[PDB]
Amino acid sequence: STGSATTTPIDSLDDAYITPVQIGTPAQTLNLDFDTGSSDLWVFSSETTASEVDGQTIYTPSKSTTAKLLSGATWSISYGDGSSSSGDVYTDTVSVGGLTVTGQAVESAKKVSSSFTEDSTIDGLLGLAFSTLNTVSPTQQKTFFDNAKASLDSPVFTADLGYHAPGTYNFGFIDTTAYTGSITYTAVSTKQGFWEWTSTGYAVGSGTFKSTSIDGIADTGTTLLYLPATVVSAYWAQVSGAKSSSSVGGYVFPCSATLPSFTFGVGSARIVIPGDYIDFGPISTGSSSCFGGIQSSAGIGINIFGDVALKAAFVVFNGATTPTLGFASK
Ligand SMILES: Cc1cc(C)c(/C=N/NC(=O)[C@@H](N)Cc2c[nH]c3ccccc23)c(C)c1
């Protein structure tokens, strides 16, 4: 089997991407944020604290003939940015782009943090990291990919995020028309439950490539690119007037700037992030200070190859017995 679904930016800045997901019988379609940095499929629901719902589409398990309460199971997740959600669990039928899993754990939110409440376009998250991170207690549950894996033509999914444009998540196959050149595969460590790999280095604009190992995670659920302070300083030093602002919470730059590209290494291959991808617009409405799309990972504790990096590539998440990651230009 295979699946193929279009993913769409939630706003003009590509702050996140949502993908329609069918849950239950008859189908209830919710737009979920596919997140390769977590492993819970959770949704706004009929059980979510009313004051914490602001425009989201909700899953109502009582209206699904295939929904079954998973007796005694609860979940609670804290994301590294400070966001959180929690609740109880159903199993139900879940389909993505024509690919169907029966008995998928669907985690029904009773509580969500303000950040989720304020994101009216995101109806929940669909985790695509390793199932070892799943928060369901007392019986840990599998991700949608882990459940689907055996039935897939090939045990893979691919992320093809668009810059200010729709993109695609495919399951079970690699669309060879979707990229240029060849896909370069690189080793993955699953020790922290993430799609963790090591970049071979970086370049700023037309500058010379610096060979240096950068360990980080491929995370579709994170907007920006978070890298060591040394690397990020070298990037912003090429932008006149750029500076790190504690009051703003990162590097900002004059909106009148033309940003240089940023290149990252995958083995001997190179992925180029165009300068425009790194512009996240005015810090507040009408401001001439703009927020940078490359930020320091210092104090996060891990480097994060978020959407800013991933959307510059066609990315293969290979879930074979020994997982690997592939990157191609496009
Ligand atoms: C200080 C800091 C700041 C950020 C932005 C992150 C990223 N976190 N990103 C994630 O955890 C995502 N994989 C999922 C996610 C967290 N919060 C969200 C809000 C909306 C949509 C997705 C997420 C971290 C780890 C630390």
Curated annotation (Swiss-Prot):
Reaction catalysis annotation: Hydrolysis of proteins with specificity similar to that of pepsin A, prefers hydrophobic residues at P1 and P1', but does not cleave 14-Ala-|-Leu-15 in the B chain of insulin or Z-Glu-Tyr. Clots milk
Coiled coil feature spans: none
Name of the protein: Endothiapepsin
Native source species: Cryphonectria parasitica
Cystine bridges: 255-290
Domain Peptidase A1: 17-328
Keyword tags: Aspartyl protease, Disulfide bond, Hydrolase, Protease, Signal, Zymogen
Enzyme class: hydrolase
Family that this chain belongs to: Belongs to the peptidase A1 family.
EC annotation from Swiss-Prot or TrEMBL: 3.4.23.22
GO biological process: proteolysis
One Gene Ontology molecular-function label: aspartic-type endopeptidase activity
This protein's record includes keyword Nuclease: no
Catalytic-site annotation from UniProt: 35, 199
